[PDB]
UniProtKB/Swiss-Prot annotation, chains A, B:
Any single Pfam family the record assigns to this protein: ABC_tran
Organism expressing this protein natively: Pseudomonas aeruginosa (strain ATCC 15692 / DSM 22644 / CIP 104116 / JCM 14847 / LMG 12228 / 1C / PRS 101 / PAO1)
Physiological role: Involved in lipopolysaccharide (LPS) biosynthesis. Translocates lipid A-core from the inner to the outer leaflet of the inner membrane. Transmembrane domains (TMD) form a pore in the inner membrane and the ATP-binding domain (NBD) is responsible for energy generation.
A GO molecular-function descriptor: ABC-type transporter activity
Classification via SUPFAM superfamilies: ABC transporter transmembrane region, P-loop containing nucleoside triphosphate hydrolases
GO cellular component: plasma membrane
Catalytic reaction list: ATP + H2O + lipid A-core oligosaccharideSide 1 = ADP + phosphate + lipid A-core oligosaccharideSide 2
Lineage of origin: Bacteria, Pseudomonadati, Pseudomonadota, Gammaproteobacteria, Pseudomonadales
Record-given protein name: ATP-dependent lipid A-core flippase
Broad enzyme group: translocase
Length: 576, 576
């Protein structure tokens, strides 16, 4: 939980270096006014005795009665300029870093591997690009402003005190070592407590996420009591840990102030006891300047905890940015491909496991040919179909599309040549038309969109919708039925005319007649495409050119409907 | 965007009223020290002339040389006590309100209607109970601390100035009207800009949510460019709007400080010009106290924007808490029910629509009877089955369970008597056993859990898992296959032995043989339960006692397999 993680933020402050320099200049101006405001008291005291005296004798008329009031205004304006220049330009830099960090994180998500999204929950990932960035940057920005403003102020004040009387200033200098030791001890405590508070807050988020995501299960199978108890315990821990940090700071700041004022007391005793020929105004200015030291130290003490509290978020932000991305070392970029797909001795095991999902799988697909896949509820049908789009990296075997290994193709170009209907249908919260035409096919004419819907036997329900093809499907298509959502997904794939079309159980939520209207229209456009089908209903794959039956990651049988039935094996048992 | 929303927070500060009073007492102590620190300068100046003078003549020996230094220490300790009492106890109250608000929001989610979760996205809801609460409460807490501390400090200082010389203090009093006008104008700007920044931030979250949730669609159908462009535009708007608010504050604070110092300049001119018989120390103390006014006003000016920035979140937090909950005015709470379910002239239309999903539906179910439902990809099969658990409220018709309308049953008791397998399988990120036994059936012996798994034809794959029944399924069961996940859900329902069992397409992701092993075990425990089945495979419902075919929300045919086939209607066409 070191604060060194903040050093990484500097890489994003390079383009804003010039603006940051201006902020320092403004803070310098503001800091310089603080000693000036103390010095004017010297002349004011002298003026009280003799207001007719002239402030400058070598102007050369302006008496203290008018000069001292005038200087007050000028110093105030000078301080105001520094305040605006420092606060405005520093915020420019801060907001720029927020924008850069957010954009970088979002782009990283678009390139991270599927496993990352698989392991982490959506609530985890969204919090990083909406709240963590703001909190981390805000804490750092406040710290920078205080350290620059209060550090300069202290430096200027000490320099002024040293100029007036270096001997007495030594007393104030001796407190600096004491303050440093106290700051060190407090920081050690803050970091430890910050670790604890961090883990507790994460548990709170986890209980909430598990509930806002599986509300239906909680309602139906009970568990409101179980879930409420978990959240209560989690929240209690976070509050207790957070209070523990407050108590430490509530004693930390007062102690340091006491040290300063104890030292100030000593200094005043010396001035009152061992008084020289110094004028009363000289002494008043010195004491006044010393009294302007406690304020900056208090502000620094307060930020000492804020920095230690934002480190946790920075660690997570700078972890996703360092996460490894999908391997895309290929260069080949063909405009179009014939559609021939060949797999040769392909064996895969999910990363972080020891089970061989698939082993020694070989099959050749040619344009205009239909390939069907059947299995036993987990034979690896969905795993093999997710290796062609290179969603998961394969190490053994060779997957070749149009004669070139899928690895040699640039990820974007390869995925452009393949259209896939995943088993889990997912629909954005937008119009039916916008969902049917997303990304590459975006902007397609309405006529083409409607044509694809007709093929998916979707136009009928889409037309009866309240606003036609412009109706909003709702969040994840909740406003639509399960089979209706599946048909919309089929339409999206049909619109993206690609040489290879993969469909993984695209008729699971459709009846026997609606599924027929889809297979009766897919066979008329199968001549210019290579079709891969993974289905459990042994009725839409009878006309497939080649049918592959898998059993525990191995292809046990090959052939067609007639040959497979004649063999009287796994296919014969499954068909019955 | 009024700040009046914060007034609602007061309802949660009632239990912490006592601690809040102590915080005020501490802040009073701290504020009282500020004028004291200025007054000591009067005696210090007098001491410079005559340190042998006694501070108290009526003690009665302690000279200024020792008394003045001693008082400095005592004031510092007094200030320290007030600081701890104010800062610690105020934080106690603040953290308590955070805990209360979070707990209330979580419990509200457990009672909100399904439509709410349906419309709002998970990212929206999770942000309210993790970040918005912290931000809103933190902003209010900082504001309260500053207004209490700086308001008191200003009051004490003005009282001291009035005591020393009321006539001159009038000059400082005249600036108060000017400051008030400036604060009013600035707040009007802040609120308007805060509205704009709020909407922009929401758009940023929305683009992120649509991406962290549909990453697979973005990868497969392109759209990385489309999505990145959207996020960039959204982030640009937020940054620009946020900067607009910074510039206003960067001019707001310096102007107010200039007003104060201009007034201070006038006061000093008067003292220097029209000097009476007042001692130099008296005048020095007065000027010193006046110079302690600019600091508090600056801090108040800074918080003037922070409050206006947290209002947006408070509006959302206090909106969910006001959202209407599910109607649960029933009182009946039976321990067990026979399982007879009767629907009489039930007609439903989803709230906010004009389409009649279902109309004039009547059917009677008895214990030990099997009821099957068939339809045409959206006839309303899933809508009718979600009215028995009272997920959606019905207005026309009567749904009676065991002779009592489902409305008269307490929601918890009614849902305890019904076991449902939804079409969308959802699994928590925990062990297989913990998912199979969740909520009411939690703590069941391992033997019972395994028995249920055997019935769902799940033990076979569960045993072959790395850690057996203790393996973690992963987030939403990603580590498990689709059919495997469905079988786990079936097991959960089987464990929760209930009089009524509803299954909506529980074999969509299963093959013809695995589905047979489930129907061969479900028929042996169907005598003591009432089963409702909504399936598209016309092979597991042939043995159903009554089969109901729906067509656009109306039951068109009734009977059994033989009678329905003889009729040669919708069932005959669908079966083929
Ligand atoms: Zn995560
Ligand atoms: Zn989690
Ligand atoms: Zn699958
Ligand atoms: Zn929402
Ligand atoms: Zn949204
Ligand atoms: Zn349905």
């Amino acid at each position: 939980s070191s604060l060194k993680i903040y050093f990484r933020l500097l890489g994003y402050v390079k383009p804003y270096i010039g603006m940051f320099l201006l902020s320092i200049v403004g803070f310098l101006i503001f800091a310089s006014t603080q000693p000036m405001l103390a010095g004017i008291l010297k002349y004011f005291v002298d003026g009280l005795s003799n207001p007719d005296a002239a402030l400058f004798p070598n102007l050369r008329d302006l008496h203290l009665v008018y000069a001292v009031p005038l200087l007050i205004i000028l110093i105030a304006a000078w301080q105001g300029l520094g305040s605006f220049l420092g606060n405005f330009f520093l915020a420019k830099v801060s907001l720029g870093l927020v924008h850069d960090l957010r954009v970088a994180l979002f782009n990283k998500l678009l390139v991270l591997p599927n496993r990352y999204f698989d392991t982490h929950s959506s609530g985890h990932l969204i919090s990083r690009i909406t709240f963590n960035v703001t909190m981390v940057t805000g804490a750092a920005t406040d710290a920078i402003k205080v350290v620059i403003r209060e550090g300069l102020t202290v430096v200027f004040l000490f320099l002024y005190l040293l100029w007036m009387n270096w001997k007495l200033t030594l007393v104030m200098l001796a407190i600096l070592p004491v303050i440093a030791v106290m700051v060190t001890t407090a920081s050690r405590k803050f970091r430890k407590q910050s670790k604890k508070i961090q883990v507790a807050m994460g548990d709170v988020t986890h209980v909430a996420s598990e509930t806002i995501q599986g509300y239906r299960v909680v309602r139906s199978f009970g568990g409101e009591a179980y879930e409420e108890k978990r959240f209560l315990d989690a929240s209690q821990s976070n509050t207790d840990k957070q209070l523990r940090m407050t108590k430490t700071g509530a004693v930390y700041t007062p102690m340091l102030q006491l040290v300063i004022y104890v030292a100030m007391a000593i200094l005043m005793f010396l001035v009152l006891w061992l008084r020289g020929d110094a004028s009363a105004g000289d002494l008043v200015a010195y004491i006044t300047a010393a009294g302007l030291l406690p304020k900056p130290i208090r502000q620094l003490s307060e930020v000492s905890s804020t920095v230690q509290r934002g480190v946790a978020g920075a660690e997570s932000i700078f972890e996703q940015l360092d996460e490894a991305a999908e391997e895309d070392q290929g260069t080949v970029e063909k405009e179009r491909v014939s559609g021939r797909l060949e797999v040769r001795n392909l064996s895969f095991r999910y990363p972080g496991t020891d089970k061989q999902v698939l082993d020694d799988i070989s099959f050749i697909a040619e344009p205009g040919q239909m390939i069907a896949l059947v299995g036993r509820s987990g034979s690896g049908k969905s795993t093999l179909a997710n290796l062609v789009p290179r969603f998961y990296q394969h190490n053994d075997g060779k997957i070749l599309l149009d004669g070139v290994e899928v690895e040699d193709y640039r990820l974007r170009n390869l995925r452009r040549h393949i259209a896939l209907v995943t088993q889990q249908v997912t629909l954005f919260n937008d119009s039916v038309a916008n969902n049917i035409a997303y990304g590459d096919l975006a902007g397609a004419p309405r006529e083409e969109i409607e044509r694809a819907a007709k093929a998916a036997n979707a136009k009928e329900f889409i037309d009866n919708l309240p606003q036609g093809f412009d109706t909003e499907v709702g969040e994840n298509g909740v406003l639509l039925s399960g089979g209706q959502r599946q048909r919309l997904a089929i339409a999206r794939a049909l619109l993206k005319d690609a040489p290879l079309l993969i469909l993984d159980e695209a008729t699971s939520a459709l009846d026997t007649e609606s599924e027929r209207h889809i297979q009766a229209a897919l066979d008329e456009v199968m001549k210019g495409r290579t079709t891969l089908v993974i289905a459990h209903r042994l009725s839409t794959i009878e006309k497939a050119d080649l049918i592959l039956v898998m059993d525990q990651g191995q292809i046990v049988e090959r052939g067609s409907h007639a040959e497979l039935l004649a063999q009287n094996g796994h296919y014969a048992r499954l068909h019955a």
